Symmetry: C2
Subunit: 200 residues, 2 copies
């Protein structure tokens, strides 16, 4: 026979809107319901410094399982509200060839700085995202302590995150990721998701 | 509670040891009645031969074996391309190659592998007789492979519903990656070493 821990993977491409929050909620909900070891959101977001964001961030922070924001596929970028979402998550991995930061108020600074500090990721850089239109390369990003992992695909990501400690608690406890006997389940975007899209 | 798809890598030159690996992976897959197994294949080649034995292994496999020439920059070469032409499904990631790297028997053989899987055999020959190399897109266009996919997930999405190119235990199968779980299989320790030594 056979059996193991589950990891869910879901994409979230395009601009972040009020409709986005519902997606995060769906995916993270499904994952929570099955006690997934974690969930990876492959995230490629490009522009319009939104606000549905901190509602998403609250979502993540209150999630009952780790949420890994993976800025993938190559060419993807996480900007404006992307980068908040990420800085507020439990782990940030990045595929080579992607970016993070701003694409090419003091309130917002206060905010990015906050997100960074509570997850021990570099807040001086965080600020510079907003105050210098900074854009990091996964390697620079990792050097500077903004992200935790650089991975070419889901599988590297799993191997490299294995055993790493969550950067912010998961329901009060810091968790050590154990992707040792894991099964990955791919979740696809719904039909409304699908349409509410092209129509944008 | 779903269907399992296994994923395994096989990088580097193909030797008599390699067979052992396919056998292991394919065996694990068979034993759990996987919906299928994907071998991410990167094979630089330069004339080897363990191949003929591996291909029989695949043909006799009790579940579909999808040869996926991956990661970007990978090459399915010489030995590789026979293994692939002899499999159930061939996908390729963008930025990879198939064919020769850079007789009146090996030709008969590539031709054969091609015909029995309905993949273009005029090109197959041209691999060996014109040291030809194809790009996933050209490969697709020419009818050598079945799928071009950026990552395991596209691969599953694009292959879903496709019919196997050669039978699986006598029956052609239609892939159904509809409620699937993916399990990644890592190279063992011997494998890991026999690499450093087979260097």
């Amino acid at each position: 026979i056979l059996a193991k821990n589950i990891v869910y993977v879901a994409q979230i491409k395009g601009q972040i809107t009020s409709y986005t929050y519902d997606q995060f909620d769906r995916y993270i909900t499904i994952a929570e319901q099955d006690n997934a070891e974690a969930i990876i959101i492959e995230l490629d977001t490009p522009g319009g410094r939104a606000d549905a964001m901190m509602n998403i961030v609250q979502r993540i922070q209150q999630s009952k399982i780790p949420v890994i924001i993976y800025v993938y596929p190559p060419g993807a970028s996480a900007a404006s509200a992307g980068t908040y979402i990420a800085l507020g998550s439990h782990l940030i991995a990045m595929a080579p060839g992607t970016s993070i930061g701003a694409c090419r108020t003091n309130y917002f600074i206060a905010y990015i700085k906050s997100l960074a500090q509570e997850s021990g990721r570099n807040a001086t850089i965080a600020e510079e995202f907003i105050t210098k239109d900074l854009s990091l390369t996964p390697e620079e990003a990792l050097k500077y302590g903004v992200i935790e992992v650089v991975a070419r695909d889901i599988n590297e990501l799993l191997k490299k995150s294995n055993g790493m400690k969550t950067k912010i608690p998961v329901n009060g406890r810091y968790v050590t990721l154990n992707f040792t006997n894991v099964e990955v389940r791919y979740l696809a975007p719904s039909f409304k998701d699908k349409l509410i899209s092209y129509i944008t």
